[PDB]
Design a protein around this ligand. Structure first.
Ligand SMILES: [Ca+2]
Ligand SMILES: [Ca+2]
Ligand SMILES: [Ca+2]
Ligand SMILES: [Ca+2]
Lengths: 93, 12, 93, 12
């Protein structure tokens, strides 16, 4: 796989792991999103250090207001925080 | 008291 | 790196390769976006098979109307097409 | 159109 292709297949399979066992086969749930993001980005992303922080994200992703998160919602989330990291990385150069 | 990490809120 | 972390650092470094040589140090250009996406996703994403297709994407990313693409624009793009792949993958099961 | 892919257009 190419560097970019490498990253595409990764988000798609890891999401399948939590989403197809502790929840709906093709849909995520309030507890599945928290587990997927925290397990590998526990110390990074703001989740466990701020249980409230996970809630702010669901609101932003609860666009349908379904109380669940679709792969179209989750992928939008990881994509938007990493970009914020590059901008705040140049603040201290 | 203060939040050590509230960056994810940056998105919200 | 964790599966998810693996993918975060990948988009950030590959983007630096094209963006910091053939264009602005921290900003992408109409020709740099086409080169970055096509080189590794030439046969996948619709770019070279449809030069017009690259133009439709820039319009969607030219939100600032700057004629360039920021890492906040590019990351949004790769994130939104892959999700469309998972939904169209279940159409034929 | 088969000789070409308009899937990205799916985005637009
Ligand atoms: Ca589930
Ligand atoms: Ca939701
Ligand atoms: Ca550039
Ligand atoms: Ca733009």
């Amino acid at each position: 796989g190419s560097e970019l292709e490498t990253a595409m297949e990764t988000l798609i399979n890891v999401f399948h792991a939590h989403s197809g066992k502790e929840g709906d086969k093709y849909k995520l749930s309030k507890k599945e999103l928290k587990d997927l993001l925290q397990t590998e980005l526990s110390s990074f992303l703001d989740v466990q250090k701020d249980a409230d922080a996970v809630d702010k994200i669901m609101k932003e992703l609860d666009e349908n207001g379904d109380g669940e998160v679709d792969f179209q919602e989750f992928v939008v989330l990881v994509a938007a925080l990493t970009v914020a990291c590059n901008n705040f990385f140049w603040e201290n150069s | 008291t203060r939040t050590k990490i509230d960056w994810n809120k940056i998105l919200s």
